[PDB]
Structures are given as structure tokens and as C-alpha cells.
């Protein structure tokens, strides 16, 4: 089921808890909020404070708050206290352009990936009412392009242009409580490298990373047309599959065993990972071009209630069309 | 005006201001700017007007903002912002000069061009490595210079006023009372 919002590309998209409202950015310095009045999408609100290209949005559902980041070295936190949305200021202390933003499972911190060889973890302070940041910078050598969060609200995956996929810990003692022991490691100070991967010789830029529901498995896609899954329960082990298609730009877990991917071929695909450590291609999911999307897909999200029970998933990309895909 | 586009001085002042705000930037290295302007067409951009016409702005993007660093291009006698900053820091007592090198803050709306942060650092480092410490390129590492420029530069006059009125909201000596001018007519604070 395809819907065409605008002819311009969609940089990024965000959903809310009831899957009623959607936030979009049509390749400009603005954010548009749309709602569904019956069976037709009609625009609802406009948010305009940036003076640069907007690069990332996310929507914390339980608190109902929208975090926005862009290439003007700014970030804002939008909240709805009256009929009109209002912003709140974030101090980031970066000198290059931001590239990614994401909320945490507990909705108390959020992580921003930027091009100054930094990862900024920001948390709230109310004595003077803004957000203050802490930096992770030790082993990173280039710009970060992807981020993800662990279910236990401490660990943080990151992919960067230096052909590496890393797992850090982002424990902030002022906000968070002490964590338990994970297979990934035991000793978890702030900004300590927990694990590193990326040794394959002909490594390319990593565009997307993702954790599983169990939290003990990581998956990432690269620009050399390869997908890879790293397991940490039995041992710190990797399994890499070399696909014969164009590069993939996003990845997300559907369950413990299956992973869904999308990219420049305009068609989402499904891979299977066995318990014994083997990746095998299964099939496409879309059996002018002979494909519903007319350009590269940039973002894949879950319409359903995420990795515990996932049934449908949403795709959006440069063509301007947004599509909902159902497995059944 | 030297492309076939005629904008009168009075009635089209606010139409070219949007072009300046949207498409202008300060170059880091002039050489690569001219190489990309002469042998490549990735600097030309099309701007739509209210009348419906489409104009094209090319190499003029990085020539207009450089009246700041070279002031003689529009008939102004001086030294430019980078050298005037040097002449201002190198005019105080010796002990406090380090206190000013580390903390330079940019404010105002006419310092939001892309690259203006990254050019003053290079100009000051080169102006301080051939005027004060001539040659001997080892001690510049110990010489720390830093420029602060948060993405909230435009309203820094307001935000400061948003703090000073908050701290001193209650005690009734900060303000000039109405009754003071009923008798005295002047102020000493």
C-alpha cells in the first residue's frame, strides 16, 4: 500500500504511539506533522526553527516529545503543552554537522551522532531548564552514520566511515541506576569501548546497525554489499554474508532469527540467521521500474509494537512515497 | 548587475537580502574556490523570484562576504576584521593578553555565514606566527587560541538580558525607581 505525500524526497520520518500522526521533513528546514481524518492524510502543523537542512527526527511515545537535529549544528526538543508546539534548547558543543538522533528505551537520555568524530549523549537538567551533553570520542576516527540502543539503557552501538562497528557504554551516574552483567562485558564506566568489529579486509562504510530483542545479538550492513551478524552469548563471534545486490542503507530486527533490509534496489529483503551461526538469503518482499518505490529507500521502521511482536513495517525514501508492508 | 539582472536600490533591497541569507559563504582557501568556479559548475544555483523569474547566482556567493576580510573592495580604508582583532588584542597590558586569546565570542546576525568561524582562526594563527613569534614553529602548540561561536549567535544580546533580569529580579537597587526622577532627575548607577 503506497501513498505519495510530496514529489520532493523525504529525509526522515517518525511515528507516534497510536500510529495516527506522522512527522516528516520534505528536504528543507521545516518539519510537517500530518494526521489522519478518516481515510485521507491532511497536514496538521508546521514546526520551523532550524536555519539549515534537517537530518534526523525521533518521537518519544510515552512522554510524547519530538527531538529534531540538523546540519546547522543545532538540536531542539519540541513539546506540546498548549495547542501549539514549543521548543526547548539543547547544548551540544559540536563544531561540525549532526547526522543522526535517537531516543533511549526509558526516554531519559538521547544520543546524537555527528561529523566531528563524536557521539553526544544528552540528558535533562531542570535547575535552569535545558539539556546538557557528554562526549564519547576516544576510538572514533571519522563521522558516525548510525546509532542504536540496547534494551538495558546503557550500551550503544555505532557505525562510522572508518570501516568499523563499535559497541560502547553510555552509563551516566546522575540519571541512570546501576546495571546488571551482560555477555558483552562486566566493567562499564562511561565512554569505555566494550567491543569492536570491522576486520574483513575490503570493508566499506557502515550505514545501519541494529540490536535484537534479546539484546545479545547485533546486525549491521555495509557499503560493500555485505550484511553481518555478531553474536555474544556462546562467544564473541561474527558471520558475514556477501550479497550480490546493490548497497543496503537500513536494517532492523523483526525477531530473534529474521532480519529485514532495504536500500538502493528499491525492494525490501528478508534474511535468516540460524542458531548455529549461518546467514542465508530467503526472498524479496515485492514479488518505469517493476517496483512500487521509484527510488532508493532511506528508512525502515516498524508499524506494529516492535521486536516483541512485529507484523507490519514501513518504508520511506527519496521518491517521496511511503509504503506499509504486511508479512501476512 | 553585471549578469543582466537589474535590481533597483530602493524597492528591491529586501529581495536580494533573501538571496544573501540563503546562498552566501566565506571561503576557507580562495584557490580551491576559484578552481571550482572556473573548471566546474557546482557553484551555480537557481533562485526563484516573486514575479516568477528564475535567476542564476554563481561565483558571486564567495565574493560578497569578503568585504569583511579585505575592506578595500568597496572603498573602505582599514585593515579588516582579522587584522583589527589582532591590533586590538595586541594593545593591552601583557598579563591580560592571554586572558583574551582564549575567550573570543562572536555575536550578531552578520557572523552566521558558513566558514566565518573557521577563517578567523587561520588568519590569527598566521598573523601571530609572522609578526610576534617570527619563525621557530615549535611554540605555537603551547600558544592556545580558541574562538567560541554557539549556533545561537543572533540573540545573545537578548539571552544575556534574560539572565541578568532573572538573578536581580527581587532586590530594589538594580532598577532606577520612578521616585528617583521625581526629585533628583539623574542617576549614578
Amino acid at each position: 500500500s503506497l501513498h505519495q505525500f510530496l514529489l520532493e524526497p523525504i529525509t526522515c520520518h517518525a511515528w507516534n504511539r497510536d500510529r495516527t500522526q506522522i512527522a516528516l521533513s520534505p528536504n528543507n528546514h521545516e518539519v510537517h506533522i500530518y494526521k489522519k481524518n478518516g481515510g485521507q492524510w491532511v497536514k496538521a502543523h508546521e514546526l520551523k526553527e532550524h536555519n539549515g537542512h534537517i537530518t534526523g527526527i525521533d518521537w518519544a511515545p510515552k512522554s510524547d516529545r519530538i527531538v529534531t537535529c540538523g546540519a546547522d549544528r543545532n538540536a531542539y526538543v519540541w513539546s506540546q503543552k498548549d495547542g501549539v508546539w514549543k521548543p526547548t534548547l539543547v547544548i551540544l558543543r559540536i563544531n561540525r554537522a549532526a547526522t543522526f538522533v535517537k531516543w533511549s528505551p526509558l526516554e531519559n537520555k538521547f544520543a546524537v551522532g555527528s561529523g566531528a568524530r563524536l557521539i553526544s549523549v544528552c540528558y535533562f537538567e531542570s535547575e535552569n531548564d535545558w539539556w546538557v551533553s557528554k562526549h564519547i570520542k576516544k576510538p572514533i576516527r571519522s563521522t558516525v552514520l548510525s546509532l542504536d540502543w540496547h534494551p538495558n539503557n546503557v550500551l550503544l552501538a555505532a557505525g562510522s566511515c572508518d570501516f568499523k562497528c563499535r559497541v560502547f557504554s553510555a552509563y551516566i551516574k546522575e540519571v541512570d541506576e546501576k546495571p546488571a552483567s551482560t555477555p558483552w562485558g562486566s566493567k562499564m564506566p562511561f565512554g569505555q569501548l566494550m567491543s569492536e568489529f570491522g576486520g574483513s579486509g575490503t570493508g566499506g562504510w557502515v550505514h545501519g546497525v541494529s540490536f535484537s530483542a534479546s539484546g545479545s545479538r547485533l546486525a549491521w550492513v555495509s557499503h560493500d554489499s555485505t550484511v553481518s551478524v555478531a553474536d555474544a552469548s556462546k562467544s564473541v563471534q561474527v558471520s558475514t554474508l556477501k550479497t550480490e545486490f546493490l548497497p543496503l542503507l537500513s536494517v532492523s530486527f523483526v525477531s530473534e532469527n529474521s532480519v529485514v533490509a532495504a536500500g538502493h534496489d528499491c525492494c525490501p529483503m528478508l534474511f535468516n540467521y540460524d542458531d548455529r551461526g549461518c546467514l542465508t538469503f530467503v526472498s524479496k518482499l515485492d514479488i518505469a521500474l517493476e517496483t512500487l518505490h521509484q527510488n532508493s529507500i532511506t528508512q525502515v521502521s516498524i508499524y506494529e509494537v516492535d521486536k516483541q511482536d512485529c507484523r507490519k513495517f514501513c518504508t520511506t525514501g527519496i521518491d517521496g512515497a511511503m509504503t506499509i508492508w504486511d508479512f501476512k | 548587475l553585471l549578469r543582466g539582472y537589474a535590481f533597483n536600490h530602493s524597492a528591491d533591497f529586501e529581495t536580494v537580502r533573501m538571496i544573501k541569507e540563503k546562498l552566501c559563504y566565506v571561503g576557507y582557501n580562495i584557490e580551491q574556490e576559484q578552481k571550482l568556479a572556473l573548471e566546474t559548475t557546482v557553484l551555480v544555483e537557481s533562485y526563484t523570484l516573486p514575479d516568477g523569474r528564475i535567476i542564476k547566482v554563481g561565483g558571486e556567493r564567495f565574493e560578497a562576504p569578503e568585504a569583511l576580510f579585505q575592506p578595500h573592495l568597496i572603498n573602505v580604508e582599514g585593515v579588516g576584521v582579522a587584522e583589527l582583532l589582532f591590533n586590538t588584542i595586541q594593545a593591552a597590558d601583557i598579563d591580560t593578553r592571554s586572558e583574551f586569546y582564549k575567550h573570543i565570542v562572536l555575536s550578531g546576525g552578520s557572523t552566521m555565514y558558513p566558514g566565518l568561524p573557521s577563517r578567523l582562526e587561520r588568519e590569527l594563527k598566521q598573523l601571530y606566527l609572522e609578526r610576534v613569534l617570527k619563525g621557530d614553529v615549535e611554540k605555537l602548540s603551547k600558544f592556545k587560541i580558541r574562538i567560541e561561536d554557539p549556533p545561537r549567535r543572533k540573540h545573545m544580546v537578548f539571552l544575556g538580558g534574560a539572565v541578568l533580569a532573572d538573578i536581580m529580579k527581587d532586590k530594589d537597587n538594580f532598577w532606577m525607581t520612578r521616585q528617583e526622577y521625581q526629585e533628583k532627575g539623574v542617576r549614578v548607577l
Binding site: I91, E125, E127, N128, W130, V132 | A92, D93, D95, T96, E148, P150, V163, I167, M168, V188
Partner: peptide
């Protein structure tokens, strides 16, 4: 010759807490 201020000392203000509050701002911003 002259003090750091490069001016005559202002005896009226000499004859007659912001710094406490500003430290948190200085920490958070920098």
C-alpha cells in the same frame, strides 16, 4: 602607571551573588 582597567579608579563604587550563580552556566556551556 595605570591599573589593568586603563582608567582612574572610581572611588564612588569603591566606597559603596552573581558570580556564584554564573559558575553553573560556565560549567554547562564550556
Amino acid at each position: 602607571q595605570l591599573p589593568v582597567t586603563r582608567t582612574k579608579i572610581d572611588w564612588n563604587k569603591i566606597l559603596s551573588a552573581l558570580m556564584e550563580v554564573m559558575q553553573k552556566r560556565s560549567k554547562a556551556i564550556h
